[PDB]
Amino acid sequence: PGVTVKDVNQQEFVRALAAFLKKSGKLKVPEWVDTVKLAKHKELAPYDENWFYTRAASTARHLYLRGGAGVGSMTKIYGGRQRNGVMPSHFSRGSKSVARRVLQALEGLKMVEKDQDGGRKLTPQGQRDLDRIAGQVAAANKKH
Template sequence: MPSVTVKDVNQQEFVKALSAFLKKSGKLKVPEWVDTVKLARHKELAPCDDNWFYTRAASTARHLYLRGGVGVGSMIKIYGGRQRNGVCPAHFSVGSRNVARKVLQALEGLKMVEKDPNGGRRLTPQGQRDLDRIAGQVASANKKQRSLQSAM
């Protein structure tokens, strides 16, 4: 059986599975201020999901898998969005630099991410192995679900 990588599975299902894995492991260091922070300057409210830090960490790990050498500056552009200015035209606004930095530091604490000598951060071999293993679990769950649906 050929091995399954992160590129082979649905990104939404993968991020949910990795987020659940990070929460279940209990090793990810979550800052105390996660329940009172906005994720960007252009956001009006804090996130509705209580586990948003795990989801952001999973999404960041997936992005580092696909494209290594990404730093905090790139992450704030990825998680930026449209700032609405009332009757004035909308403009792009970057995401929170502190949130991006703390997520990368938390992933470094798990030994999933390391600093790249060329700048930015990249996945460690252990982190890549973990992500591929979770992608395999997602793919096998999808395969079982498809076989059950075809049997009906």
């Protein structure tokens, strides 16, 4: 028993996990979080319907890796161009309306919350919870 957050690959087990978290149905969608520009480099946006879970994925990966961060310093990792017409490129950022309202829709999910030094951080009860979902699905249908 027991699995680690950085042992195996992520796509399919988070597919199952985010499918469960989208079929929960308790998430009443904030109505001012989809019209967001986010970034210019994207010609489109995620349609997984775990899209709020996608900015949550950015927060989760880039705060587990290096703590004490928000959703703007989370990308130093795609350097090169952002050919944006007449002005030069920029470095990634994060919309804070999106963060406010994912925070308002993330109470009770025990994933992440505002830390005590700015940004986001994994909750201890939530950390136990996510290790528990990992282990339980490992024992049940994903890693047995």
